[PDB]
Design a protein around this ligand. Structure first.
Ligand code: GCP
Ligand code: MG
Length: 307
C-alpha cells in the first residue's frame, strides 16, 4: 500500500498569501512550505516549514522586483529547499509572477522539486494590466521559466478577477476565488489518492496525466438534482480565471463521486461533456467513487493536459 505525500510551497508574497489563506481554510494531509526573501512576511506565515532565502542579498527584505536576485536567492538555498521537500511525491508551487522573488525563485524551487523526484505542478498568477507593461513582460519570462521547470503549469491572469467581481467585491474575496483553483485541485487530488474507488484511480494515474505535460487544467464541479452530472462536469471545466481552458485537451483524468444512485448513463453524460468541450479525441482516465453518505450530490473532478 502506497501513501502519497503532497506539499504546497508558497514562493514570494502572493504565494505565501495563498498558503496562509489555504491553511486558514483548513487542509489536511497536505504539508505547507513557505519560501521568501521577505523575513517580515515569513514571520507572519502559518506554514510549519519556513525557508528564508537570500538574506545576504536582500538583508531580509524582498527582492524589489529584481528576478535575478530571487533566482540567486533560491539557488543559494538549494540544500535547505531540498531538505524541506525530501519525501514529497507531489509538490504544488504557487507564486505571483512579475516581481523579483516569485518570478525568480519559483522556477528554481520547481526545478529542485522535480529533481528531488516530486511530481511538480505550478499554479501562478500574471499581474493585472494596471500594474503596467514591464511587470507583465517580467511575469511572462517567469511563466516561461516555470513551464520549463514543472511537470504541469496552471496560469491565472489576475485580469480575470476583474471578470468575476462587482464594483464592491473586496479585493480579499477576489483573491480567495483565485486561491480556490489551487486549493480545490489539491483537495481533489488528495481525495483521489486516499479514497478507494469502484473504478479506482490512484497517484500513479495522476502521474500519468501530469508528468512532463506543460499546460494543464484542474477543476472540480458539484451539482445535484436533474442533470446533475452534466452540470457538475460543466462546472469542473469552467474556467473564468484560467489562461488554459479545456479546449484542445488531449488527455483527461475524470473522477466522478456520487451516492449509490450514481447511474451509468449520467457517467457517460459527464464524460461526453468533457470530450465535447475539449473538441479533441481525448485519452480519458476514468474513475468512479461511490460515497453512500452522499444523497443527491455528484462531484466531478477533472485534470486535463495534452495541449
Ligand atoms: N491573485 C493574487 N495576486 C497576487 C497576490 N499577491 C500578489 N499578487 C500579484 O503577484 C505579483 C507579485 O507580487 P509578490 O508575490 O508580492 O512578488 P514578490 O516577488 O514576492 C515581491 P519582490 O519583487 O519585492 O521580491 C503582484 O504584482 C500581483 O500581480 C495575491 O495574494 N493574490
Ligand atoms: Mg517588494
Amino acid at each position: 500500500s502506497h501513501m502519497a505525500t503532497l506539499k504546497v510551497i508558497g514562493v514570494g508574497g502572493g504565494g505565501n498569501n495563498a498558503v496562509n489563506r489555504m491553511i486558514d481554510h483548513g487542509m489536511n494531509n497536505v504539508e505547507f512550505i513557505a519560501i521568501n526573501t521577505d523575513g517580515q512576511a515569513l514571520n507572519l506565515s502559518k506554514a510549519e516549514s519556513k525557508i528564508q532565502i537570500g538574506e545576504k542579498l536582500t538583508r531580509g527584505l524582498g527582492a524589489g522586483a529584481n528576478p535575478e536576485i530571487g533566482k540567486k536567492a533560491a539557488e543559494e538555498s538549494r540544500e535547505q529547499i531540498e531538505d524541506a521537500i525530501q519525501g514529497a511525491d507531489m509538490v504544488f508551487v504557487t507564486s505571483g509572477m512579475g516581481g523579483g522573488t516569485g518570478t525568480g525563485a519559483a522556477p528554481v524551487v520547481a526545478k529542485i522539486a522535480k529533481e528531488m523526484g516530486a511530481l511538480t505542478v505550478g499554479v501562478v498568477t500574471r499581474p493585472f494590466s494596471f500594474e503596467g507593461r514591464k511587470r507583465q513582460t517580467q511575469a511572462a519570462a517567469g511563466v516561461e521559466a516555470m513551464k520549463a521547470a514543472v511537470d504541469t503549469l496552471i496560469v491565472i491572469p489576475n485580469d480575470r478577477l476583474l471578470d468575476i467581481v462587482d464594483k464592491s467585491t473586496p479585493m480579499m474575496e477576489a483573491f480567495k476565488e483565485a486561491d480556490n483553483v489551487l486549493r480545490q485541485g489539491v483537495q481533489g487530488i488528495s481525495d483521489l489518492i486516499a479514497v478507494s474507488g469502484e473504478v479506482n484511480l490512484d497517484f500513479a494515474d495522476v502521474k500519468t496525466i501530469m508528468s512532463n505535460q506543460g499546460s494543464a487544467l484542474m477543476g472540480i464541479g458539484v451539482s445535484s438534482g436533474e442533470n446533475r452530472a452534466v452540470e457538475a462536469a460543466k462546472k469542473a471545466i469552467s474556467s473564468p480565471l484560467l489562461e488554459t481552458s479545456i479546449v484542445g485537451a488531449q488527455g483527461v483524468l475524470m473522477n466522478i463521486t456520487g451516492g449509490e444512485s450514481l447511474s451509468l448513463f449520467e457517467a457517460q453524460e459527464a464524460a461526453d461533456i468533457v470530450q465535447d468541450a475539449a473538441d479533441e479525441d481525448v485519452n480519458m482516465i476514468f474513475g468512479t467513487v461511490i460515497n453512500p453518505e452522499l444523497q443527491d450530490e455528484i462531484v466531478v473532478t477533472v485534470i486535463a493536459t495534452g495541449f
